[PDB]
């Protein structure tokens, strides 16, 4: 039996699925700790930029969880992603510890731009800026990748890098009341928010697990971008980002929420 995590419903992905929008034909790279083989995921390819972990399998759990929020398969098992027919790519930039370097992350972004990714999900970040990282964000963006990144978990009124960069779409986390999660970073550069508390998704060991974080919010938006791209195949990264923001539901504060809560129904109307 399949269950629909509350955040998938909150962003109104099922309304888009009922219009025949699933993210089919859209290439989404998850730049994370890998993605483990799982019966509720279809992993099309990928690459590893972590020396010492040549495979794209996930030794941490975080990348597999993120992937499932984007693209858990619509079937009779497990959970259901925002964009369950997205073409999923495992781009390992973080090791099994959950840490990586700005170089590894930049190599993932240059892979995404060299391989025709439409969306790159970066559920990662740091409080410090990086020229290496920024360069790669801009390069990927010029190659048509929509870079979607987590605002961070410090609870501060400023957001992490690379989400703070103009060419990244920065995503904060909300709770079931549509309030900002206590940990969710906000402030300048914040674009949008999505569910990020008690988010159930795919997890290694062929199982499912619930996590909190702006890392969990980010893939809701990555998935919504894929729905928008399937409906509007001619649109650019910038067009999709702007439409997601224009169609988001206001949550009563630009500082705390950016454009507000992502809404896949309104964005695919």
* Feature table: binding site for Ca(2+): 2, 40, 73, 75, 77, 79, 163, 165, 168
State the binding partner of 32 from Ca ion, ligand EI3, none, CB within 5 to 8 A by kind.
none
Chosen from Ca ion, ligand EI3, none, partner binding at 2 (C-beta under 5 to 8 Å by type): Ca ion
**Span interacting with Ca ion, options 67-75, 161-169, 186-194, 239-247, rule CB under 5 A:** 67-75
The length of the chain is 269
Distances (CA, A) of 12 to 102, 204, 250, 262, 265: 34, 26, 15, 9, 6
- Pick the catalytic residue from 17, 32, 118, 201: 32
Active site residue 62: yes
Measured from each CB, the residue nearest to Ca ion is 78
Write the interaction track for ligand EI3 spanning residues 187-206; mark x where CB under 6 A is met and - where it is not: ----------------x---
Strands 43-48 and 87-92: parallel
Specify whether the CB–CB gap between 220 and 197 falls below 8 A: no
**Residue 40 in contact with Ca ion, rule: CB under 5 A:** yes
**Binding partner of residue 61 among Ca ion, ligand EI3, none, CB cut-off 5 to 8 Å per kind:** ligand EI3
Which DSSP string corresponds to 46-115? EEE-STT--S---SSSHHHHHHHHHH---SSSS---SSTT-EEEEEE-B-TTS-B-HHHHHHHHHHHHHT
- Least Å distance between CB 224 and Ca ion? 18
Nearest partner of 118 among 234, 268, 266, 255, judged by Cα: 234
Among residues 101, 209, 239, 249, the one that binds ligand EI3 under rule CB under 6 A: 209
Which of positions 180-239 make contact with Ca ion (CB under 5 A)?
A: none
Kindly state the smallest distance separating residue 186's Cβ from ligand EI3, in Å. 22
Distance CA 245, CA 260 (A): 8
Q: Is 215 a catalytic residue?
A: yes
103 is catalytic: no
Among 5, 7, 46, 61, binds ligand EI3 (CB under 6 A): 61
Confirm if 235 and 224 have CB atoms less than 8 A apart: no
CA-based torsion, 70, 73, 74, 80: positive or negative:
negative
The H or E element that residue 133 is part of is: helix 131-142
- Residues annotated as catalytic (active site), given as ranges: 32, 62, 215
Footprint of Ca ion on this chain (CB under 5 A)? 2, 40, 73, 75, 78
């Amino acid at each position: 039996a399949q269950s629909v995590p509350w955040g998938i419903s909150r962003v109104q992905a099922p309304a888009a699925h009922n219009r025949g929008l699933t993210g089919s034909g859209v290439k989404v790279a998850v730049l994370d700790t890998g993605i483990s083989t799982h019966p509720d995921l279809n992993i099309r390819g990928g690459a590893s930029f972590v020396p010492g972990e040549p495979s794209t399998q996930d030794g941490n759990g975080h990348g597999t969880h993120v992937a499932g929020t984007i693209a858990a398969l619509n079937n009779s098992i497990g959970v259901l992603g925002v964009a369950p027919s997205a073409e999923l790519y495992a781009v390992k930039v973080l090791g099994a510890s959950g840490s990586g370097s700005v170089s590894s992350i930049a190599q993932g972004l240059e892979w995404a731009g060299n391989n025709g990714m439409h969306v790159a999900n970066l559920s990662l970040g740091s409080p410090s800026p990086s020229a290496t990282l920024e360069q790669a964000v801009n390069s990927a963006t010029s190659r048509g990748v929509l870079v979607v990144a987590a605002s961070g978990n410090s609870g501060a009124g400023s957001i992490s890098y690379p989400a703070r960069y103009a060419n990244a779409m920065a995503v904060g986390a909300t709770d079931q009341n549509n309030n900002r999660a206590s940990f969710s970073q906000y402030g300048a550069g914040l674009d949008i928010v999505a569910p990020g508390v008690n988010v159930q998704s795919t997890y290694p060991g062929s199982t499912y697990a619930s996590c909190n974080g702006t890392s969990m919010a980010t893939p809701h938006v990555a998935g919504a971008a894929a729905l928008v791209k399937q409906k509007n195949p001619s649109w650019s990264n910038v067009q999709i980002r702007n439409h997601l923001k224009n169609t988001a539901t206001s949550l009563g504060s630009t500082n705390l929420y950016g454009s507000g809560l992502v809404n896949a129904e309104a964005a695919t109307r």
